[PDB]
Design a protein around this ligand. Structure first.
Ligand SMILES: O=P(O)(O)O[C@H]1[C@H](OP(=O)(O)O)[C@@H](OP(=O)(O)O)[C@H](OP(=O)(O)O)[C@@H](OP(=O)(O)O)[C@H]1OP(=O)(O)O
Ligand SMILES: Nc1ncnc2c1ncn2[C@@H]1O[C@H](COP(=O)(O)OP(=O)(O)O)[C@@H](O)[C@H]1O
Ligand SMILES: [Mg+2]
Ligand SMILES: [Zn+2]
Length: 424
């Protein structure tokens, strides 16, 4: 018998920063994979929240940096724990656990485990990975070194703890339905027949954020038709932008690193066809088409997109309707109106509409990771069998204040799209 230390919460210190390497980033978070040997962290990633360089901290009426605004505290009040969260990491944990998982189900979703971190750990991590980051990401934001916590997650690009290579695919599917809202005016009619994703591509192109419009159409992927699902995967492969990434054993072999990337050219195709050597048994020039059928069969077979789309549809009125409830919620005179129905609703209904809008925004912006290992898919072509797992990531809580930005962006997108279409 040997005396062990009592339980003690893990704290990442300056020295541990060298054990973590850049995996990627979205707008709000940086993600690092563990490169060490400690059993606590093998097969895990750490998720670190970023801070925009200009942003002023949220403070309550006593001037204390706080997690939620009073408005958000009221919007999310249905769950006592969630609105009590003492920091941003707990907030995200309880959001996923208490809001999303009751809607999406626990099989494909994990709220993550919190770990304490020193200011110096975050500063060194910030320093170490700068050279890996897209320069425009660096311009905009860095690690938030005021945080005392981060989130540990399972590394989905590894089908690990024996099984050989693991090819994982990340899909960022965006919004899969067209609005029917009565609050969309006749000048904005094209919103009821052309996906947000398609219209946004044109604006992204105008701002030189992409080199070409994507071939991907979310309506295909969310169609529930195996044949249209396959067409979406082929589209994502052709123009990955920031919607499609492939990893071999955790290393990126297709798609961008922390950003969108250009169309898959013949040469990128060759490298990727070579990268599938062994994983798929096929004669040179046919592995990738087998690979895309594999991905397609796993997306369609799992049906994870069905329940995700019902949550996206919690955006029932479109931002053009929901923006009016927003201004009622915070008791500000509506600048959109110059209405009834929406403004005559009881406060509780307005709150509900806005809360469901923000839940729907979470669902329109998350990603799916599907890892494969030789729940299984077998390809009718080459006669192989692959186990696979599916996992959601980036089911993040959106700030209530963003309703104003959502309305302004939406107005920008449809305005520009109309101008373009009117050029005949
Ligand atoms: O920076 P990008 O790679 O272009 O991605 C962003 C980002 O999504 P990620 O969190 O997945 O990176 C935004 O979310 P934040 O990170 O800033 O919270 C999101 O904004 P919303 O979810 O608030 O809408 C926005 O989506 P959208 O453009 O639909 O508003 C989306 O941009 P794209 O997916 O269009 O590139
Ligand atoms: N649990 C995970 N396992 C493996 N890779 C992940 C995991 N979480 C995130 N990533 C990778 O890191 C990237 C950024 O993560 P994400 O949380 O989407 O950033 P943000 O929250 O800023 O949108 C993703 O595009 C994905 O490739
Ligand atoms: Mg995010
Ligand atoms: Zn109004």
């Amino acid at each position: 018998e040997v005396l062990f230390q009592g339980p003690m919460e893990m704290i990442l210190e300056e020295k541990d920063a060298s054990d973590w390497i850049y995996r990627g980033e979205g707008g709000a978070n940086l993600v690092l994979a563990y490169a060490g040997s400690s059993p606590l962290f093998v097969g895990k990633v750490i998720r670190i929240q970023k801070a925009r360089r200009n942003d002023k901290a949220i403070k309550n009426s006593n001037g204390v940096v706080s997690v939620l605004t009073s408005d958000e505290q009221h919007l999310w009040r249905e769950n006592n724990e969630l609105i009590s969260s003492p920091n941003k990491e707990v907030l995200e944990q309880r959001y996923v656990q208490n809001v999303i998982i009751p809607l999406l189900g626990p099989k494909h979703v994990d709220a993550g485990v919190r770990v304490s971190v020193s200011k110096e750990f975050l500063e060194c991590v910030d320093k170490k990975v700068t050279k890996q980051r897209p320069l425009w990401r660096v311009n905009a934001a860095n690690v938030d070194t005021s945080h005392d916590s981060a989130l540990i997650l399972n590394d989905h690009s590894l089908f690990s703890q024996s099984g050989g290579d693991c090819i994982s695919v990340e899909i960022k599917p965006k919004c899969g339905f067209l609005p029917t809202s009565r609050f969309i005016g006749k000048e904005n009619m094209l919103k009821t027949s052309v996906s947000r994703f398609k219209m946004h591509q044109l604006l992204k192109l105008e701002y030189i954020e992409i080199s070409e419009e994507s071939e991907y159409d979310p309506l295909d992927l969310f169609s529930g038709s195996k044949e249209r699902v396959l067409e979406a995967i082929k589209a994502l492969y052709s123009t990955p932008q920031n919607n499609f990434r492939v990893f071999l054993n955790g290393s990126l072999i297709l798609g961008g690193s922390g950003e969108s990337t250009g169309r898959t050219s013949p040469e990128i195709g060759y490298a990727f066809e070579d990268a599938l050597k062994g994983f798929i048994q096929s004669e040179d020039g046919h592995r990738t088409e087998c690979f895309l059928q594999l991905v397609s069969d796993a997306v369609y077979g799992s049906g994870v997109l069905d329940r995700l789309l019902e949550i996206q549809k919690l955006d029932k009125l479109d931002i053009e309707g929901a923006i009016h409830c927003y201004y009622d919620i915070i008791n500000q005179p509506c600048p959109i109106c110059k209405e009834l129905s929406l403004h005559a609703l009881p406060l509780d209904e307005s709150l509900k509409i806005v809360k469901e809008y923000l839940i729907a925004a979470t669902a329109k912006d998350c990603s799916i990771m599907i890892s494969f290992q030789s729940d299984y898919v077998s390809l009718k072509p080459t006669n192989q069998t692959f186990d696979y797992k599916v996992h959601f990531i980036d089911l993040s809580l959106k700030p209530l204040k963003r309703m104003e930005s959502y309305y302004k962006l939406d107005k920008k997108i449809i305005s520009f799209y109309n101008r373009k279409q009117k050029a005949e």
